A paper describes a structure:
In this report, we describe crystallographic analyses of a three-domain RSV IN as well as its CCD-CTD fragment in a new crystal form at a much improved resolution compared to previous studies. Although crystallization of a purified cross-linked IN-DNA complex has not been successful, we have been able to collect a 1.86 Å resolution dataset on a crystal of RSV IN(49–270) cross-linked in crystallo to a short viral DNA end substrate (5/7 hairpin DNA). The crystallized RSV IN (49–270) contained mutations S124D, C125A, E157C, and F199K. In our crystallographic model of RSV IN(49–270), the average atomic B-factors refined isotropically at 1.86 Å resolution for the CCD, CTD, and the inter-domain linker are 35.6 Å2, 47.9 Å2, and 30.7 Å2, respectively. As noted by Yang et al., the relative configuration between the CCDs and CTDs of RSV IN is stabilized by a large number of hydrogen bonds made by residues in or around the linker segment. Given the high similarity between all the crystal structures determined in different contexts, it seems likely that the observed conformation represents the intrinsically stable native conformation of the CCDs and CTDs, rather than an arbitral conformation captured by crystal lattice contacts. We have provided data rather contrary to this idea; a particular conformation of the CCD and CTD of RSV IN is observed independently of crystal contacts, and appears to be important for viral DNA binding. Our structural and mutation studies collectively suggested a role for the asymmetrically associated CTD dimer of RSV IN in viral DNA binding. The crystal structures, combined with earlier structural studies and our in vitro functional analyses, suggest that the asymmetric interaction between the two CTDs is an essential feature of an RSV IN dimer for viral DNA binding and catalysis, whereas the highly flexible NTD is required for IN tetramerization to promote concerted integration.
Author numbering:
A (entry chain A): 52 to 145, 154 to 269
B (entry chain B): 54 to 269
């Protein structure tokens, strides 16, 4: 689902960006902890393309412990499975990367239109424009956040232990014995005190214990 | 000089293993020694601008870049590009010391790594086109995320000064008196409370939102 610190869990997807035609496939990875994004451009959705993409992302961000994707063949082929195994990266199929895709496309749109490109970006200007978008997204604050994704990526805040909370389970009851490690707007990461098991739950199902 | 993102050096070097895009644009941050490379079919103003935009996306925006006096660096297109980005630029003789020595060393490091990685994947001459991008990325990973020689710090460490922070910003809390007490750091916020940790006692408590303020 989500990492507690950077380079734990990434999410990756392909998305189509007609402004970047003819090579309009963008491979997008987001680090689920820092929100930093890496994007590369490709002519086709293939196993080879995703391998190049991840190698690029690793060069920028460092090597993750695990990557989550959908069921698509580029991600689950023998070639890609052996590639991930070689790099020692766990893989799951089955979101943050969806929001990353939207932010990226909005940014590409703003930058292109700013250069007078209402439709297709001229082929020779595409690489530069994509890099500019990536710079804006990683090196500038995301809306209301006080730190940029790249700052959160290299200097993350990771609580060693959190404060005690109760969580609402199933019987409608509130259960003690949990501590909160991350408390965001939508979700919270909570750890069971007896096992150190960590689960993600909606914020509304968590409240301070005492 | 001292400090990352102050002075970069950029050069183009030929790497026939990377044909047909055998011109490698190479930038090194002279403080952190971090290297970024992109490949190009020819040395043009467009290639230079793609390269620097890429390097900036990876490393951040530098104050200044030093290059030789090739037409791609001194063109009107590139002059105006640099100006739009607010980056200072100085040119020199190709190979010159004060502005090209470090990037010359980076060229050799990079080409040695490309050779070792390629021959390691069983490619003794030209690297298959479909494998080139990945191999360049792997070379950047190896050059930036591992220590150069006797260094205790990797270029990534010098560039970003990584660390893990274990608490949020300092805060002060309103205690029973009306006094605002310093010596606390916030851990998380939720449901109208802040969880705060006392720097001196390590006590962690939940405090109503309205009774917590940032400390200076």
């Amino acid at each position: 689902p989500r990492g507690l610190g950077p380079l734990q869990i990434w999410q990756t997807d392909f998305t189509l960006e007609p402004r970047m035609a003819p090579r309009s496939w963008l491979a997008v990875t987001v680090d689920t902890a820092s929100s930093a994004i890496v994007v590369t451009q490709h002519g086709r959705v293939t196993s080879v393309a995703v391998q190049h993409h991840w190698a690029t992302a690793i060069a920028v961000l460092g090597r993750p412990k695990a990557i989550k994707t959908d069921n698509g063949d580029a991600f689950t082929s023998k070639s890609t499975r052996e590639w991930l195994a070689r790099w020692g990266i766990a893989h799951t199929t089955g979101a943050m990367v969806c929001r990353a895709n939207r932010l990226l496309k909005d940014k590409i749109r703003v930058l292109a239109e700013g250069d007078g490109f209402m439709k297709r970006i001229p082929t020779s200007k595409q690489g530069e424009l994509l890099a500019k978008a990536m710079y804006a997204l990683n090196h500038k604050e995301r809306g209301e956040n006080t730190k940029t994704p790249i700052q959160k990526h290299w200097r993350p805040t990771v609580l060693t232990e959190g404060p005690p909370v109760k969580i609402r389970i199933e019987t409608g009851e509130w259960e003690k014995g949990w501590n909160v490690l991350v408390w965001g707007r939508g979700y919270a990461a909570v750890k069971n005190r007896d096992t150190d098991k960590v689960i993600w739950v909606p914020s509304r199902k968590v409240k301070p214990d005492i």
